[PDB]
Write a protein that binds this ligand. Structure first.
Ligand SMILES: *[C@@H]1O[C@H](CO)[C@@H](O)[C@H](O)[C@H]1NC(C)=O
Ligand SMILES: *[C@@H]1O[C@H](CO)[C@@H](O)[C@H](O)[C@H]1NC(C)=O
Ligand SMILES: *[C@@H]1O[C@H](CO)[C@@H](O)[C@H](O)[C@H]1NC(C)=O
Lengths: 81, 418, 98, 49, 49
């Protein structure tokens, strides 16, 4: 639900969509309220771009996960003089 | 037979601002053409599939807008962090590397750009006009353009062509002089002056951006244009297009369907034309932005990830290096360039004749102070002695025009004598 | 019918004052007038610093100077006779107007 | 093990033509859509911007 | 509608001219204000001036 603070996702029009209007998977981003995805603490190069740095993809007995997209690995070149 | 050889240089920093993307808009065709009026939705339904074409176009646009920023910035396959060091041969990089003090990784020049580039928007929201946020936030851009700036400093032209290899900063600037003609001994004997000129140039740039009549007018022209076209798209809901009135509820509450329809249709044909015009303007302007975001990618790939030999491409003068900085919907380039100064007239000669055979320079020109003849590199006055080491003999001195009688000193014979 | 054609900001007599200052710098200064203060250099002695950029050494030029001059001049003459011919190659410019 | 080395050169002048600009046109919308007709100017006025 | 079509054609053709007037600027900046090493850019053959 784009640019909708999560409180407003109702009313109870059809329960098959009310399932996607509530639950524990309700997640908030800077692009709106995303429902039906699990918010993980990993980081990946992202497959389906939600927006504002959040991306979602399908994986593990599997489900849709919405993570924060990863730019890449770290490195620190040993710069001496 | 008169040449002019520079004797003192000047390292100058320019600036260049390039648009990269623009706001990702999206209009809800039904909600705009006739919104909240079920009595008009059916009428519009039969009018064709314009409602979905004018949403697929604005989706393609908002997708390439996300792709342009990937193209321009995401050119490093890793994320380098500059080591906590200051031993940059005297060069000062405070004004461009990210600071620890500020909570974000914004450098002292990237913030001068954010605080320089600058109801109705709610009304657009009520009319189905949405502005989506970009995929790459303004805190992730700063984590690329600070990994594109800690690789150039500590690795050079190598981090963009394989595994990054460290190299002392001084000893890489001297391998950038050696790419534009001036030999290395020029750098290693003028190191302090070069550092104290580069630092001053950076300071003057920082004071230049903060001035009024800002050169970043290119970046705030994009926003002005894309916020002016969309305001006309809302101004044009006040025109009735020759119908009874411009409010759809008025027409619905003054006329029965047999006569209401023949007026709604001269509304539905008036708003859809405006929407199509807006979509076409967006398509053309997005083509311009696409053109100008594949030149920024090229300048980032060449002026930054290496050194350029294309004249007047990476800033006026001989190009030494560059530094990228982020900016709202744009990229800023700080081309650091080498500029000669203080020319000085000299008398030259094509080729020199020692024993009838004509000696020629290997790298440089022949220059005389009026009495003695030397051979010098061409972008700096560094006279040497005309030896059989740096002149290659070729032919007989009767064919070249301008040959000068002189003497060439061989290093072998005098030292060998004992 | 309200269809107006405005005149350009730069007249066709000011264009000729740029493309004759872009052509008296190349001849007498070379690659330097576009990268700082222009520095003079004898014309021959700059063509030999343009041979030395494409591989051929300078002694090639300084020992073939007359032939090079008498070939460049002939090339210019043939170009002048080529433009004056029909089926002009400037069809790109008169396509815009058409 | 066979190479081919040129022995005599040829200096050639080409030509290249590039468009730079085009005629700067401008149309007066009212004067064209319905000109010299005050009875139509009002009608066109309400038609939008 | 005719006027809008004409304006759109002008916009597109002006985009073409803009594209072809930033290649002429590049060729003037490189082929003239220096020497080029890009093959078959400043005319066929090794480019002198
Ligand atoms: C969203 O709703 C919560 C719950 O009322 C509120 O605390 C928060 O301030 C709201 N934020 C926005 C951006 O509307
Ligand atoms: C993920 O990070 C948030 C932010 O601190 C934290 O509250 C949460 O417990 C973390 N969850 C996991 C599974 O690491
Ligand atoms: C240069 O020009 C002067 C003009 O009098 C002439 O005397 C001299 O021989 C010329 N030298 C060369 C090398 O062209």
């Amino acid at each position: 639900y784009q640019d909708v603070n999560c409180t407003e996702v109702p009313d109870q029009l059809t329960p098959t969509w009310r399932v996607y209007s509530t639950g524990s998977n309700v997640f908030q981003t800077r692009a709106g309220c995303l429902i039906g995805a699990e918010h993980v603490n990993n980081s990946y190069e992202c497959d389906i771009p939600i927006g504002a740095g959040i991306c979602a993809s399908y994986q593990t007995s599997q489900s849709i996960i919405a993570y924060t997209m990863s730019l890449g690995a770290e490195n620190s070149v040993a710069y001496s003089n | 037979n008169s040449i002019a050889i520079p004797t003192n240089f000047t390292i100058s920093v320019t600036t260049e601002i390039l648009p990269v993307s623009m706001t990702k808009t999206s209009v809800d065709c039904t909600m705009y053409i006739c919104g909240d009026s079920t009595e008009c939705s059916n009428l519009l339904l039969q009018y064709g599939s314009f409602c979905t074409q004018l949403n697929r176009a604005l989706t393609g646009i908002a997708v390439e807008q996300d792709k342009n920023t990937q193209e321009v910035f995401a050119q490093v396959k890793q994320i380098y962090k500059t080591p906590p060091i200051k031993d940059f041969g005297g060069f000062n990089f405070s004004q461009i590397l990210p600071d620890p003090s500020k909570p974000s990784k914004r450098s002292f020049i990237e913030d001068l750009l954010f605080n320089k580039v600058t109801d109705l928007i709610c009304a657009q929201k009520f009319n189905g006009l949405t502005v989506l946020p970009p995929l790459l936030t303004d805190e992730m851009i700063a984590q690329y353009t600070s990994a594109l700036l800690a690789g150039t400093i500590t690795s050079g032209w190598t981090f963009g062509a394989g595994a990054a290899l460290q190299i002392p900063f001084a000893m890489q600037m001297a391998y950038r002089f050696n790419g534009i003609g001036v030999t290395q001994n020029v750098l290693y004997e003028n190191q302090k002056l070069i550092a104290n000129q580069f630092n001053s140039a950076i300071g003057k740039i920082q004071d230049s951006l903060s001035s009024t009549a800002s050169a970043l007018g290119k970046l705030q022209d994009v926003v002005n244009q894309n916020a002016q076209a969309l305001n006309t798209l809302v101004k044009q809901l006040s025109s009735n297009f020759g119908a009874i009135s411009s409010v759809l509820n008025d027409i619905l509450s003054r006329l029965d369907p047999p006569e209401a329809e023949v007026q709604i249709d001269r509304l539905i044909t008036g708003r859809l034309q405006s929407l199509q015009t807006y979509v076409t303007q967006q398509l053309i302007r997005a083509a311009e932005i696409r053109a100008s975001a594949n030149l920024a990618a090229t300048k980032m790939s060449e002026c930054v990830l290496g050194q350029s030999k294309r004249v007047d491409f990476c800033g006026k003068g001989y190009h030494l290096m560059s530094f990228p900085q982020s900016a709202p919907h744009g990229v800023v380039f700080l081309h650091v360039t080498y500029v000669p100064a203080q020319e000085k007239n000299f008398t030259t000669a094509p080729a020199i004749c020692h024993d009838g055979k004509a000696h020629f320079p290997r790298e440089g020109v022949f220059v005389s102070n009026g009495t003695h003849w030397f051979v010098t590199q061409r972008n700096f006055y560094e006279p040497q002695i005309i030896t059989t080491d740096n002149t290659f003999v070729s032919g007989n001195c009767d064919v070249v025009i301008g040959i000068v009688n002189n003497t060439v000193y061989d290093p072998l014979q005098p030292e060998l004598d004992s």
